[PDB]
Structures are given as C-alpha cells and as structure tokens.
C-alpha cells in the first residue's frame, strides 16, 4: 500500500536511550537510576546503534521501549512527586517560621535517619521481582553478601546509621534462624573474608562476610546506588526472615 | 503484617523476562558469589599457593616485558622525530605529428 | 570446509572486549599474600581486596548496571551579577 518511511520500525522502535527514557518518564536522573535498579530494568545493546540514535556513542545506554512502558505504570512515581511536594511544604513552613507545622509535615516524610527503613516502600516490588520464595532463596546470596557488608560500614547520607543498625538486626535474625534450624553447612576462612554455605529448603546459599575491621569506601564505586541496592535487599530480607520464622513456627520479629 | 508469595499491565513484558547482558568472555552467567578455591585460603595448601604464585609470576613477567617493549618503541619514536627535526633545521640553515 | 569452520559458568577473571558504560572494567587487583607477608595465625592475617568494590564489579559484570565514572564537579549555570535597585537608589 502506502510506502513506509525509514526509521519508523524495527530497532528504532524497539530501543530508546537513557536520555529519551528519562524524558519519557519525566523523572530526575537519580530517581530514574533508583527505579531501574529497584524494578530490574537492565541495559541493552542494539545490533546497530546508529539505527536507534544517530548521535549514540559507545557509552550510550539503551533500554527496551516496553520496559520503559512498564515503568510508566509504577506507583512509586506518585510517591516521588508526593515527597517532592511535601519537601516544598516543609520549606515553606520553615521559611514562614511555623516550627510546629514543619515538624508535623516532616513526620509524614518517613526519613531513613528517623525510621531506619527505606524512604519508599518496596513491598509490592518484592513480589513482582521474586514470583517464588525459591527465587528469593536463590537471590539470597547477593542479598546476604550486600547486607553483611553494609552492617559494618560508617554512617553516610545515603545510608544512615539507623538503617545500618536495621541491616545488622536483619542479619542477626537470619543467623538466629540458621542456628535454631542447624541449616549452616560449610565455612571457609579466605584472604578476603569468611564464606558461609547453608541449606534452606534444598537451596544452597553461599555468601561472604568481611572480617571485623575498618572498611574502606573508595571513590571507584557508586555508593549511592549501592545504598539503593541495600534498601531493596533489606526489604527482601525482612519478608524472607518472616516467612522462615513462620514456617518453623516462631514469632517474628524476635 | 504483610506476606508476599502467598489500564495497568498486570502481566510483565517478556522483554523483562529476557536475561541481562553478561560481561564474561564466554558469555555465560557469572554467579553472584563465586565458589572460592583452596589457593585463596589464609593458610593455604603448599601446592595451591605455589600454583597461584606461578600464574601471578608469569603474568608479572609478561606485563613487564610488554611495558619495556612499548617504552623502547616510544624512545625510538622520539629519537626519529629528533633526527628529522635536526635535518629540517640543517635544511633551513642551508637554504638561508600524425 | 565451510561447514567444518562453522561447526568449530562465566568467570570474572577474563572479560569481553566490548565495554558496558563509559569505560571497560580494569583488571582485578592482586589478591595474593606474597611469601614475605605470610603469617602463622588468624590474628595477624592481612585482608586483601575491597568487598564493596567486589560487589560493585559483580553488579557491572552480571550486567544489572553499566560502569560510570564519578563527576566531582558539575558545570555551573552561566550567570551575571548585578546590583539591586534599592541598593542603587540608596542615598545618604
């Protein structure tokens, strides 16, 4: 029938760059990176990047158009906008000198430095990312390594001290479950740390714990997006601990 | 409390079900926590420690050989450039029915 | 011959040549106790590497995110300084 025009189908429709994705979702870059990490949106590579974007380079990040379409319906966008508007209201109250109003509005912010929990609730995200408790047990290696690492770090603006204490509390609860069920199998003292291998419901779980020393935070890592990983992993480990304690018939939290 | 595992797109896209890219040379999936070997122990076996020392030693030797080779190539390049510049300065000195 | 030519877990140690992000990931730091530095006790053990760097490299290698560099200084908006009208019209 009518002649098609070039670039209106194929890879150009299948992919978009990070700039186009951010402009499509109307987010800031930190919020977009945080949401991509929390929802499992992964970078992709077209066969020919010139067909997707003529100004693309080797460092250009690509994503699936359908993945960005799925991110369009995430309820955390409204949470981000509500928190931004709430911060504007707190700034107005502090600028007008209403200290009681500012404190009352700040109580609605749910700050990690006050609660020890992540600023945004990821409970609906946990079930979406892990359809089964077996998948949760299989991602527990990364979860336990990250949380046991962050339980010995100093307080930062990205990861506050109360949230570090919550990391330590969750790790201790998991250790207590392993003690009472005798699920721990192997341990190994390497030059990097102590490896632990346990067996929970037929799944081998291996994770690495640092020796108790001063840990160095270097500039070659992205500590803030590591903190986003930490928030997701503690949200996962809370539900994992609750399910394990309820399965072995113990009260949670202890 | 709350317990998981017990128009909006309630169906996830299959593009999300696609596997993420692996940076491994063979293209296979890398484990989150790789299983350590006996050579990484703090008090390792003699055979494992000597083996690991052999691979790290030969890697150090080949890296040092490569960096010395490229340093020598750079030195020759600057010597050639200096010789050509000296020749150019000398050339300017001499110029001054079917 | 053409058919024969067509007929003929991953590791962190060796990586692909193509990069994922602003740079290709460097070779891992040497995790080995040199023979002068061996100790006879767990108390005198010298831990090697950095586990935060290890988790970040594992994230990049498994491909959940791409490798980016830190931006220490961001470019500031080009602005011009000028005096307020009240402070210009002040007289004494």
């Amino acid at each position: 029938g009518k002649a098609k025009k070039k670039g209106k189908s194929g890879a150009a429709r299948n992919y978009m760059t990070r700039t186009q994705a951010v402009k499509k979702l109307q987010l800031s870059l930190p919020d977009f990176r945080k949401l991509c990490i929390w929802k499992g949106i992964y970078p992709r590579e077209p066969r020919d990047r010139r067909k997707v974007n003529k100004s693309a380079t080797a460092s250009t990040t690509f994503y699936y158009t359908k993945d960005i379409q799925y991110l369009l319906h995430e309820p955390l966008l409204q949470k981000f906008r509500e928190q931004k508007a709430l911060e504007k209201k707190i700034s107005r109250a502090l600028g007008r000198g209403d200290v009681s109003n500012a404190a009352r509005l700040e109580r609605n912010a749910n700050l990690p430095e006050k609660t020890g929990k992540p600023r945004y609730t990821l409970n609906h995200i946990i079930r979406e990312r892990y359809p089964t408790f077996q998948d949760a047990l299989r991602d527990l290696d990364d979860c336990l390594s990250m949380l046991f690492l962050f339980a010995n770090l100093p307080s930062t603006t990205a990861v506050p001290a109360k949230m570090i204490a919550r990391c330590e509390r969750l790790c201790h609860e998991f250790q207590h479950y392993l003690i009472v069920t005798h699920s721990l199998r192997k341990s190994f003292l390497s030059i990097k740390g102590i490896y632990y291998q346990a067996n929970i419901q037929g799944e081998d779980i291996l994770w690495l714990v640092p020796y108790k020393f001063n840990q160095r935070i270097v500039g070659d890592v992205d500590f803030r997006i590591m903190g986003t990983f930490v928030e997701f992993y503690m949200t996962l480990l809370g539900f994992v601990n609750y399910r394990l304690y309820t399965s072995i018939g113990l009260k949670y939290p202890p | 409390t709350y317990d998981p595992w017990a128009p909006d797109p309630l169906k996830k896209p299959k593009t999300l079900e696609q596997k993420p890219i692996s940076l491994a040379a063979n293209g296979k999936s890398v484990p989150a926590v790789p299983k350590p070997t006996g050579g990484y122990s703090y008090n390792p076996a003699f055979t494992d420690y000597q083996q690991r020392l052999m691979e790290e030693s030969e890697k150090a030797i080949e890296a040092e050989r490569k960096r010395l080779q490229e340093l020598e190539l750079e030195r020759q390049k600057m010597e050639a450039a200096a010789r050509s510049a000296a020749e150019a300065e000398a050339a300017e000195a001499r110029a001054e029915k079917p | 011959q053409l058919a024969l030519q067509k007929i003929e877990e991953g590791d962190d140690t060796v990586l692909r040549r193509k990069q994922l992000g602003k740079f290709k990931l460097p070779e891992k730091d040497l995790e080995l106790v040199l023979p002068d530095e061996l100790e006879d006790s767990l108390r005198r053990l010298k831990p090697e590497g950095n586990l935060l760097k290890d988790r970040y490299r594992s994230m990049i290698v498994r491909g959940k995110l791409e490798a980016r560099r830190k931006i220490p200084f961001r470019k500031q908006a080009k602005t011009k300084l000028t005096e307020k009208w009240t402070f210009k019209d002040f007289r004494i």
């Binding site: 500039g219 | - | 040497l30 023979p35």
Partner: peptide, 25 residues
C-alpha cells in the same frame, strides 16, 4: 626481572591507588 619484586611493585601501586581513592563583610 625478579617476579617477587614485580608482584611487590604491582601491589604497591594498587595499594597507593587504593588510599588515593579512599582519601571583608
């Protein structure tokens, strides 16, 4: 080229990079 000194040198530069990264009105 003694491999022990080469490994010591490599560990020295890796270490040095490690603490360099971690460091009138």
């Amino acid at each position: 080229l003694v491999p022990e000194t080469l490994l010591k040198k490599r560990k020295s530069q890796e270490k040095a990079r490690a603490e360099r990264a971690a460091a009138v009105i």
